[model samples]
Target chain A: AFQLHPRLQQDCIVLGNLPLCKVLLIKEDIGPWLILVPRIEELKEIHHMTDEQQIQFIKESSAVAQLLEDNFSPDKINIGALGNLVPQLHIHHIARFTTDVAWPGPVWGNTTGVIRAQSSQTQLVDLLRDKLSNISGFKRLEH
Target chain B: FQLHPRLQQDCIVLGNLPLCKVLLIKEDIGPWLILVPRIEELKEIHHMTDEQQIQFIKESSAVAQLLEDNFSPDKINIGALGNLVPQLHIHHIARFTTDVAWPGPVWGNTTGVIRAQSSQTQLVDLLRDKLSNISGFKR
Candidate 1:
């Protein structure tokens, strides 16, 4: 069975599901960061995925990146799959600005404990859910 | 016609894979390799053409597998952060549980150990020898 990691479930709000991934918004006071987790069991690395899954992962990942760029207009979108803390294979698509707090540096461990207002988080989540609904095979999460 | 100035200055060229030009970072922090697609002005993976995107992932995975086979690290960190260098280069870093930046990202923490010329040459030779077996890899 495909189960979301406790850390991911605790830290992200379920946005919806794409054809190949579960799109979740990181519930941190950071940029409009999104994580795409392939609903696979015990998958830890990109190379560990099957060829078809790899292609699907990249395609879905690129779509999410495009969504962030189209909506946020960030200077750069940082993409990473460093599962050091959480071994599940989730890729981060972070919308980064030149003046961001962690600008010119990796975002890990730098913006820890920063929290945004619940309403602010909800607004962004709603905006993204609306945008993501347009993608093919996107099913919005009821919760 | 050449690598971005930052990439040229910071990395040692290790020839070309089918869809990317491989380079070994000069810093001996870990067995790190960067794969830069030969296309121009490509700063993001999503900007790549559909075919290019597929090839890029294939080549990137191959490079990561190569590092895993050779280094046997506890983990492999792959990223495409173009904040500093606006070139579309994918970084494949083999990480261990006991490394200096263990369990955390190597970026913005831990100064790299610059490799000596002799050490760099040896490592490059070893990689080239191994990479030669793969098709479409050229020096």
Candidate 2:
């Protein structure tokens, strides 16, 4: 069985699940940040994924990146899978702008710690769900 | 025409993998490898075609495996942040718990130490030899 890590579940709002990954929106106000966690149990690294899973992960991640790019038109899209702390196989797709809080710097410890408000989170969730609906095998969570 | 100027300044080109140009960052801050696709003016991973993206993942995974087999680092950080040099490079860094910027990202954290000339030559030779066995690796 696959379950999201406690830390990620606490910090992220469940957006939905793609074919291979669970899309979660980080509860931070930094930017349009999303995380893709392949629903495989106890997975830690990207290279550890099987060939088929690896290809599917990239496709799902690319869909998230395209969603961010088309919606936000960010200056850059930063993608990373650093399991130093959480140790889950979660990949971050962050929409970065020149005027962002941590411009030109990796967002790993350089955040403002501003959690998005409830209303704001709901609005973004609706927007993302609508955008992701067109993607094949995407099932939007009712949360 | 293929390599970007900023990447050329900061990294030493090792050679070409099947889908990417492997370069070693000159900074001796752990064994860091940058794999840049040979395609020109590519800034983001999403811009690559589906087949190219799959190949990129395969090549990146191969490099990560090589690093893990050789260095056995505590963690392997894989990222593609083109903010500084919008040339679409993916970093495959081997990180140890006791490294200079351990538990934190290497970006803007630790001052990079210039790798010695002799050390660079030896490391490049070793890496090339190890990678030579791969299908389309070229020194």
Candidate 3:
């Protein structure tokens, strides 16, 4: 019952941690993707996690990676912690395909995006949320 | 003192660790390098410390890129672990210049001996003995 609004204008909301995470922007440029960022906070790795929490977060990270792989079937899945621009602990689950400009490498400077159509974004969001919600034990993590 | 001749055969000996690091191999076929095993045990990444993991990868990658940009238009190549050779810990490195291979990615069956002369050995040995040779091998 807590849908999210778009954050960077360029991104469409896909998922979030309610008071914390917001999964945004999934398209051809940075496809099969989701960005998890802290709400109402400047970007910083420790902003979303304490030292001990970082450990737990890393563990959960792999699971989140699994969700992307199982659902999207990306050519190459890239998991990165580079917060240079955003400066947040936001994780990038990038689905890279060989056809894309920077295939087989990082997507920092890849070509401009082909923005997802609104109808498609809606379908993707619905599918992803429904699937995640129905999972055996995916209770919305309270902040 | 505990060095083995197999790993020492024409290989650029970097440095040594007590059980599992031999930090060697300066120049491979195409400006590539290697991190050999000196450990009597495992040579996997998990066998290394967190800091060690970060340091080695960083230094090796940095060196490869730095060496490439300044000297030639070379692509950086890096790899480690000796689950097969298990004795010497070596990281394979290569600076793939365009005259050699542009973005082709240097790996297996590519250990051609381009610069393995005696002076090559000496130059590599010089690199081998440098204290920082094994930047992350200690502890």
lDDT of each residue in A16-93, candidate 2, tens digit only: 899999999999997788999999996888989999999999999998899999999999999998887788889999
Give per-model TM-scores: 0.97, 0.97, 0.46
Model 1 agreement with the true structure over A1-143: per-residue lDDT tens digits: 99899999998999999987999988888889899999998788898888898999999998889999999999999999889889999999999998888998988777866776799998998999999987778999958
Worst 10 residues of 3 chain A by lDDT: A1-10
> What's the lDDT for all of these models?
0.88, 0.90, 0.47
Between candidates 1 and 2, which one is better according to DockQ? 2
Instruction: Give one digit per residue, the lDDT tens place, for model 3 in A1-143.
Output: 32332334345454434233454545543566665553434334332344344433433444455566678765555544433333334556566566766655456445476766778866776776665554333444322
Once fitted onto the true fold, the runs of candidate 1 whose alpha carbons sit more than 4 angstroms away are: none
Docking class of 2: high
Model 3 error, position B107 (Å): 19
Best by lDDT: 2
DockQ for each model: 0.84, 0.85, 0.06
Candidate 2 lDDT over B1-139, as tens digits, reads 4799998999889999988999999998768899999898898998999999999999988888898888888889999998988789999999989888889898788776888899999998988888886679998
State candidate 3's DockQ. Answer: 0.06
Greater lDDT among 1 and 3 belongs to 1
Q: Each model's number of backbone clashes? A: 0, 0, 23
RMSD of 2: 1.1
